[PDB]
Amino acid sequence: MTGREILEKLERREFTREVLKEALSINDRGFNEALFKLADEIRRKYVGDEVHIRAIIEFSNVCRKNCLYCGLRRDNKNLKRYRMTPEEIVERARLAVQFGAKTIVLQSGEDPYXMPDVISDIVKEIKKMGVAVTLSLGEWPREYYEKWKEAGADRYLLRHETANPVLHRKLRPDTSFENRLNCLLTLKELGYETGAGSMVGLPGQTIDDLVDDLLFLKEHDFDMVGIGPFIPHPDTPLANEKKGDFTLTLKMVALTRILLPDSNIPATTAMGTIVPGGREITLRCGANVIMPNWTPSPYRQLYQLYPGKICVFEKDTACIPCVMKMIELLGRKPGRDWGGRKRVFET
Ligand SMILES: C[C@H](CCC(=O)NCCC[N+](C)(C)CCCS(=O)(=O)[O-])[C@H]1CC[C@H]2[C@@H]3[C@H](O)C[C@@H]4C[C@H](O)CC[C@]4(C)[C@H]3C[C@H](O)[C@]12C
Ligand SMILES: Nc1ncnc2c1ncn2[C@@H]1O[C@H](CSCC[C@H](N)C(=O)O)[C@@H](O)[C@H]1O
Ligand code: SF4
Ligand SMILES: [Br-]
Ligand SMILES: [Br-]
Ligand SMILES: [Br-]
Ligand SMILES: [Br-]
Ligand SMILES: [Fe+3]
Ligand SMILES: [S]
Ligand SMILES: [S]
């Protein structure tokens, strides 16, 4: 089908595998731009003009896992490891709330030290501030997830990374797609708002793989979907592999919006890392969430999933004000509430 035909099918919501592969495979400028306009329009129609700010505190870069793409992988000995104390995390959280953050995201490598009781304590103290708490701590026992829910956690981000179980296993040798998926399913059952998502341009990943990621996201109707390009980190086995294409990743964001019109989709730090102004672009192509880095110095510079992360040289407190300005110059509006998913039931 031609680009015009694919758009009309997408507009009609005939989301066949073939329509999705063709969408990802056509490189025509005119087609891409129309696809971005569609997704921008569906975003506006379903989730409005509010850009939700999730203040992310990356509280530890310790990790027991060895994912091949990740600078925090345990085999990376060329990284200063840190752990924030629960007091520092709580007080850093409080500063974000004082700055107007309505969701706190606590993210870390898979660091056993905190698990589960110290996270429980931290979540309970943060929840007292009357904001949403989102956890992004990786794969843990059902029991841990349960304790964290009971402690007051609202949401959990656990990117599925890749729905190709063979590629998944090769890139994440400690675990599997089955395990990853089971965590997402457990999270959902426990009542978390859950986030999935994938990297784009992983070594060995094909367009068919990306289509499978879309159909997976659509299958499970995730509340949130984080998508970024793969960015090689020099202290990893994937150091000399090619970074993910910005445009292709932006197309995955657009199609995710089209497939899940009422989902919460961030313009991820990785998009802004590979293209100057990439998050702003992404916010105009389907995304409606931003997650300003609230990780304090001198730890911020040490949380290197991938290198070059923008926002590492600014003052600790700069990213909240910066994203507020961003939201305003994009002609958008800050989130007025916790910005949980607001389901519009359709056919
Ligand atoms: C933290 C300190 C000291 C006082 C304090 O501790 N303030 C708690 C505020 C609590 N809330 C954010 C929940 C207010 C919501 C009321 S509101 O009327 O905005 O809905 C106060 C003093 C002035 C405040 C900044 C300015 O104002 C400008 C700007 C407005 C944006 O908007 C949010 C970002 C920013 C940078 C503000 C951040 C923060 O806040 C500041 C630094
Ligand atoms: N090199 C890289 N390039 C782009 N994104 C990467 C990356 N390394 C890691 N990421 C992204 O960063 C996300 C958060 S990693 C931190 C959360 C937790 N350890 C977990 O694994 O889920 C990952 O899910 C991954 O998609
Ligand atoms: S992606 Fe998460 S689990 Fe994998 S090495 Fe990085 S921080 Fe650890
Ligand atoms: Br969130
Ligand atoms: Br465990
Ligand atoms: Br995300
Ligand atoms: Br990211
Ligand atoms: Fe910033
Ligand atoms: S930012
Ligand atoms: S920033």
Model description:
By secondary structure, the protein is α/β, with parallel strands linked by helices. The protein has a single domain (1-347), classed as Aldolase class I (TIM Barrel), CATH 3.20.20. The protein has helices at residues 3-12, 17-25, 29-47, 86-98, 117-127, 142-150, 165-171, 177-189, 207-220, 246-259, 269-274, 278-283, 319-329, and strands spanning 50-60, 103-108, 132-136, 155-157, 193-196, 199-200, 224-225, 228-229, 289-290, 333-334. The strands form two sheets. Strands 1, 2, 3, 4, 5, 7, 9 and 10 form an eight-stranded parallel sheet that branches. It has a two-stranded parallel sheet with strand order 6-8. Strand 2 (103-108), helix 5 (117-127) and strand 3 (132-136) form a beta-alpha-beta unit. Helix 3 (29-47) packs across helix 10 (246-259). Residues 63, 65, 67, 70, 72-73, 109-110, 138, 305 line the site of iron/sulfur cluster. Its EC number is 1.8.-.-. This is [FeFe] hydrogenase maturase subunit HydE.
Give the helices and strands, then pairings.
Blueprint: H1 3-12, H2 17-25, H3 29-47, E1 50-60, H4 86-98, E2 103-108, H5 117-127, E3 132-136, H6 142-150, E4 155-157, H7 165-171, H8 177-189, E5 193-196, E6 199-200, H9 207-220, E7 224-225, E8 228-229, H10 246-259, H11 269-274, H12 278-283, E9 289-290, H13 319-329, E10 333-334
Parallel strand pairs: 1-2, 1-9, 1-10, 2-3, 3-4, 4-5, 5-7, 6-8
Helix pairs in contact: 1-2, 1-3, 2-9, 3-10, 4-5, 9-10
